[PDB]
């Protein structure tokens, strides 16, 4: 997983 | 002297220009700073240099990802691909990144707070086997005489690849990189009207940078052995 990226792309 | 015109990809070259610049700092405009540090001998790793070499890392990754969202159509794409994208490109970018901040009269590079380091120091900050192989991609580089404009379109076509793996929506990749790729070519040759080899040439400079970056991601794993704590979650992420 991500959650760093994600975060950043979401938001 | 005369060109055809090219509103069109004349407006994406400018979007993608502003958003390098807004993402990076130019190494003309910045006040260049040094550090004495491990800056005489080779070390196995200078923990204070990796502390501020892993934090500008993690800051400039946190710009790519900026740079990227700046890309008309961008974020179009499933988050899973701009994932995927971002994960394969990353230390592509980052590598062309230091290396436009190459200083060959004092052999040095420039980071974007305006950090300093020799070419020992950079080995020491964590480049170790890979100091020379990056330099050495630097001092060819310069001869391009690229600006702000050709190194943004570059790191783009160079995200904007729908050739990595598993990409949710390939094609859309490549419908997006292709305006990229035009506009790159038309550039060129505006700037430099008598060198039509310009343009394979530069794209050239990103299978380069996809030898170093492939070596890169070893580096990763010797780095996590010589640390103390964890790798920057980011780095781990990007790298992961
Ligand atoms: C080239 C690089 C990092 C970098 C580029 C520009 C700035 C800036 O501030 O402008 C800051 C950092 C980099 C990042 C991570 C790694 C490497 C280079 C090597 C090639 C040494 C492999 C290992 C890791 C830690 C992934």
Redesign the pocket.
């Known amino acids: 997983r991500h959650k760093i990226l994600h975060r950043l792309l979401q938001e | 002297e005369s060109y055809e015109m090219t509103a069109e990809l004349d407006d994406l070259t400018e979007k993608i220009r502003k958003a390098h610049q807004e993402t ?2 130019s190494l003309c405009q910045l006040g260049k700073y040094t550090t004495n540090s491990s800056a005489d001998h080779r070390v196995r790793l200078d923990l204070g240099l990796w502390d501020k ?2 934090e ?2 993690t ?3 946190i ?1 790519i990802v900026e740079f990227a969202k700046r890309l008309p159509g961008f974020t179009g794409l499933t988050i899973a691909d701009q994932i995927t994208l971002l994960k394969a490109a990353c ?1 592509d970018i ?2 062309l ?3 436009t ?1 190459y200083t060959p009269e004092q052999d040095t590079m ?4 305006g ?1 300093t380091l020799n070419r020992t120091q950079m080995h020491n900050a ?3 086997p ?1 100091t020379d192989l ?1 330099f050495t991609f630097a001092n060819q580089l310069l001869p391009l005489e690229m600006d702000d404009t050709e190194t943004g379109l570059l790191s783009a076509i160079c995200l904007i690849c729908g050739d990595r793996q598993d990409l949710e929506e390939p094609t859309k990749v490549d419908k997006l990189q292709e305006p990229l790729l035009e506009a790159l070519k038309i550039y060129i040759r505006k700037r430099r009207p008598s060198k039509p080899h310009m343009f394979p040439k530069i794209l050239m400079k990103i299978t380069d940078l996809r030898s ?2 492939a ?3 070893e ?2 794993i010797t ?1 996590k052995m010589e640390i103390p704590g964890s ?1 920057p979650p980011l ?1 781990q992420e ?2 992961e």
């Open positions: 990076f700092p070499f892993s500008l890392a800051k400039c990754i710009k230390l980052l590598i990144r230091i290396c901040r420039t980071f974007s707070d950090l964590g480049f170790g890979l990056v170093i970056s070596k890169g991601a580096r990763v780095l790798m780095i990007m790298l």
